[PDB]
Design a protein around this ligand. Structure first.
Ligand SMILES: C[C@H]1CN(c2nc(Nc3ccc(O)cc3)nc3ccccc23)CCCN1
Length: 469
């Protein structure tokens, strides 16, 4: 009564009624649309969530690319509990009502072999991919895992036991949860010595080791970001702390470090000390560059572009020309929408830390420039092509996440950079206003030379340089 729709048309497969199994409703413009201008598997443009689930577990062929993109992006259109219920509903396939003749027929044998078993195995593959690559869904919702484990314990049949045991094995391993191929260089120390963590500061630590330790820290933060933290702009929305925890740590580290570089410059009231502070920051930038940490490079560029720093003409003119040329070459990476940076990224060799902000910007642009739904007369369809476009960008982020640095962690220095709090008790607005007022104090408008302020420390301003020892 219901049927599934090259050089010969074979007999149609008989299916159960949609009244008892939602997924066999005929495809139409009102429930699924394909990228027909794009090219063996048809590319899904959008559909109802029921049709997306049907195609996620399609009986005719496997679709690994859709499975991957779906499981990365589905939270922007479907809740995890809802997804599990839909997959279970998909699994529990009723057989077509036997005709007066059946009351095993050839049609029913076809149905179990061509439809039921393939769809059920597709679902088990989706479960496997789900727990393998998105197990945080199950850490975040213990009931979701209980439902899944209970369901797979109900799956009968020798043919499916190996899939069930493969899923259970992954769950087992997930619930349970540094070597060097060549010797990392010795940790570098300047004025602050090992263990003296209360004296740690921008000018007392070694500029080489500041850049190394910030690079190890930023590499770790970058590596831990999952693509679903970026989908649907969830890191800016209500539940951001639950849905984007690693992304937020990355963003907040960058905010704090950029403000700290600004603070170090503007609070150096003594002119010669401030020029030495800026010069040291440029040396840290150089080492970031040597390490291919372009996140760190552009954090420093961002800091010197802050108004309170940028307006310090006397400080930039007092820089050695050699320091000026290094700074300005890095600033030019960012110009014309990061043209030169993007050329450099495509050519570098690992390990590296890419500039994270450009991905965030491109995802926000894509989220804003595409509608979540395709508009229909009846129920509007989920715009899946939008999610694919976002997944393309998150796929780029992941290329650089398995690239460890041959550098030794310094635990005290790592804690120092994890605990930076340049704002004190000020709000961001208060702190920004404070920095600008301090800028005005240390280089007043139209001063022909900066006023004299006392030196802040009694140490040499001389850098140890960026040659490793
Ligand atoms: C004279 C500038 C001062 N300045 C900067 N100068 C330079 N380079 C520079 C070239 C020639 C020179 O004689 C001295 C410095 N690089 C920067 C990089 C990041 C932020 C600001 C600046 C800030 C205001 C613009 N006017």
């Amino acid at each position: 009564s219901y049927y599934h729709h090259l050089y010969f048309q074979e007999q149609p497969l008989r299916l159960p009624s949609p009244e008892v199994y939602r997924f066999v409703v005929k495809d139409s413009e009102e429930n699924i649309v394909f990228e027909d201008n794009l090219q063996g598997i048809p590319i899904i443009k959008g559909g109802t969530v029921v049709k997306l689930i049907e195609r996620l577990t399609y009986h005719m062929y496997a679709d690994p690319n859709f499975v991957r993109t779906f499981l990365t992006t589905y939270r922007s259109f479907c809740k995890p509990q809802e997804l599990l219920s839909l997959l279970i509903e998909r699994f529990e396939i009723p057989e077509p009502e036997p005709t007066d003749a059946d009351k095993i027929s050839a049609d029913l044998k076809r149905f179990r072999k061509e439809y039921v078993q393939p769809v059920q195995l597709r679902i088990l593959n989706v479960f496997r991919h789900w727990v393998e690559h998105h197990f945080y869904d199950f850490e975040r919702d213990l009931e979701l895992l209980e439902r899944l484990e209970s369901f797979i314990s109900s799956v009968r049949g020798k043919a499916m036991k190996k899939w069930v045991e493969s899923i259970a094995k992954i769950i087992r391993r997930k619930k349970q949860a540094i070597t060097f191929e060549s010797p990392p260089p010795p940790i570098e120390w300047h004025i602050s010595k090992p263990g003296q963590f209360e004296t740690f500061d921008l000018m007392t630590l070694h500029p080489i080791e500041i850049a190394r330790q910030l690079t190890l820290l930023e590499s770790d933060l970058y590596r831990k970001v999952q693509p679903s933290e970026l989908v649907g702009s969830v890191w800016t929305k209500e539940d951001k702390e639950i849905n984007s925890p690693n992304l937020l740590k990355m963003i907040r580290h960058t905010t704090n470090l950029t403000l700290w570089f600004e603070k170090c410059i503007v609070e150096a009231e003594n002119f010669e000390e401030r020029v030495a502070v800026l010069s040291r920051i440029i040396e840290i930038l150089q080492v970031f560059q040597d390490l291919n940490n372009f996140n760190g490079v552009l954090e420093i560029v961002s800091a010197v572009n802050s108004v309170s720093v940028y307006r310090l003409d006397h400080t930039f003119e007092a820089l050695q020309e050699r320091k000026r040329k290094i700074l300005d070459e890095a600033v030019e990476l960012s110009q014309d929408h990061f043209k030169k940076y993007l050329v450099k990224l495509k050519s570098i060799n690992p390990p590296c830390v890419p500039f994270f902000g450009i991905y965030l910007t491109n995802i926000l642009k894509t989220e804003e420039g595409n509608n979540d739904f395709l508009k229909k007369k009846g129920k509007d369809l989920i715009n899946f092509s939008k999610r694919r476009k976002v997944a393309e960008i998150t796929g780029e982020i992941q290329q650089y996440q398995n690239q460890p640095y041959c550098l030794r962690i310094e635990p005290d220095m790592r804690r120092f950079f994890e605990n930076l709090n340049p704002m004190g008790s000020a709000s961001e607005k208060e702190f920004t206003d404070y920095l600008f007022n301090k800028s005005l104090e240390i280089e007043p408008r139209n001063c022909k030379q900066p006023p004299r302020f006392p030196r802040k420390s009694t140490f040499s301003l001389k850098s140890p340089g960026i040659r490793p020892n």
